[PDB]
Amino acid sequence: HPETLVKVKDAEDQLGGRVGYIELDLASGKILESFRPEERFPMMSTFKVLLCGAVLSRVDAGQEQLGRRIHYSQNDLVEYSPVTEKHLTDGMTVGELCSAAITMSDNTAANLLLTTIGGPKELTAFLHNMGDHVTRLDRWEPELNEAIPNDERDTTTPVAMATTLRKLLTGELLTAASRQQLIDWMEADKVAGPLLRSALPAGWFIADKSGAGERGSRGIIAALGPDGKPSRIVVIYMTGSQATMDERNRQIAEIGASLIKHW
Ligand SMILES: [Ca+2]
């Protein structure tokens, strides 16, 4: 809707820097609206939905096991690890690790999962394998949220991310069981309050994952819809701004309020 596009362009002037936007029909895959659709933005924690996508994929192939118990040391714990910092002696399962990464953006969990598959380039090779020759993860947490200007490392484009998420959520890549699991994790997202969720009305469904970076980087990928079912995929990204994480949060919630108003 033209109005939401006007509000995205307004968000950019307000925040400074760059804002990327795309709205996609879940069933058709049709692009409804867009802004800087083919430009690169640092992925940030949003990549974790792609990681667990890769992981579930190996489970589906009988190569991985969600119940498999992984162990780690205190040197594995990097910044921000609400869950993993609790289970140093326990260990955690691939499942619980994926649950931590998506529902809590646990950075250490994400690192552990990355190891199970061989790291950044392996995740990228997964992306490349499924038709996404644009998205790329190069580093680990937390260096990947660095978002240096004009650095194509750990970046994606709105359209690239949006269509990849769609393939993961609805395609024939992942079994039904795994497609359900991945969206269950995203619906159980607990660290994305002041974004799309804060504009979402009662009755509406939302499965999402947010991200925060340096240099005012901020992002979110979501599957949302009314009537308790998802029907569109929304992807928002921003970086290069000096505005605080609130003025950024507020601009995302507003973009959200607008996509809902002109549904
Ligand atoms: Ca502008």
| Residue 209 among known ligand-binding residues | yes
CB atoms within 10 A of CB 112: 22
Task: Give dist(CA 84, CA 69) in Å, integer.
Answer: 13
Q: Cis (ω within 30 of 0) for the bond into 142?
A: yes
HEC sequence for 139-188: CCCCHHHCCCCCCCCCEECHHHHHHHHHHHHHCCCCCHHHHHHHHHHHHC
Three-state SS at 76: coil
* Among the listed residues 136, 154, 135, the one whose alpha carbon sits nearest the alpha carbon of residue 214: 154
Structural Rg of the chain based on CA atoms: 17
List phi, psi (to 5°) of 30. Answer: -70, 135
Task: Give dist(CA 208, CA 120) in Å, integer.
Answer: 22
Length of the chain in terms of residues written: 263
Q: Which residues pair with residue 238 across a beta bridge?
A: 19, 218
Helices (H), the chain: 2-15, 48-60, 94-104, 107-117, 120-129, 158-170, 176-187, 245-261
Task: Give dist(CA 25, CA 8) in Å, integer.
Answer: 19
Q: Which of 38, 85, 143, 152 is catalytic?
A: 143
C-alpha 20 to ligand 1 mean position (Å): 10
Known catalytic membership, residue 64: no
List phi, psi (to 5°) of 33. Answer: -140, 165
List phi, psi (to 5°) of 226. Answer: -85, 175
CB atoms within 10 A of CB 193: 12
Asked if 112 and 98 touch (Cβ cutoff 8 Å), the reply is no
Asked if 173 and 240 touch (Cβ cutoff 8 Å), the reply is no
Q: Which residues pair with residue 69 across a beta bridge?
A: 93
**Structure tokens, 214:** 């340096």
C-alpha distance from residue 37 to each of 31, 40, 191, 236 (Å) = 10, 9, 26, 10
C-alpha distance from residue 3 to each of 30, 233, 256 (Å) = 19, 18, 12
C-alpha 9 to ligand 1 mean position (Å): 6
HEC sequence for 57-86: HHHHCCCCCCCCEECCCCCCCCCCCCCCCC
Q: Which of 23, 33, 45, 178 is catalytic?
A: 45
Q: Which H or E run contains 24?
A: strand 18-25
Known catalytic membership, residue 45: yes
C-alpha 242 to ligand 1 mean position (Å): 15
Method: X-ray
**202 CB-near residues (< 8 Å, 6+ apart):** none
Burial degree of 54 (CB within 10 A; 0-12, 13-18, 19+): buried
CA atoms within 13 A on the CB side of 185: 28
C-alpha 58 to ligand 1 mean position (Å): 42
Three-state SS at 260: helix
Q: Which residues of 147-157 are buried (b: 16+ CB within 10 A; e: fewer)?
A: beeeeebbbbb
Asked if 26 and 241 touch (Cβ cutoff 8 Å), the reply is no
Domain 1-263: CATH class, spelled out: alpha beta
**Structure tokens, 33:** 């609206």
List phi, psi (to 5°) of 188. Answer: -85, 20
Asked if 109 and 86 touch (Cβ cutoff 8 Å), the reply is no
| Residue 99 among known ligand-binding residues | no
Domain ranges across the chain: 1-263
C-alpha 174 to ligand 1 mean position (Å): 38
| Residue 30 among known ligand-binding residues | no
**Structure tokens, 123:** 């995740």
**Structure tokens, 16:** 């400074």
Task: Give dist(CA 142, CA 78) in Å, integer.
Answer: 7
List phi, psi (to 5°) of 32. Answer: -85, -50
* 71-187-120 Cα angle (round to 5): 45
- Data resolution in angstroms: 2.7
**82 CB-near residues (< 8 Å, 6+ apart):** 100, 104, 106
**Structure tokens, 139:** 């580093």
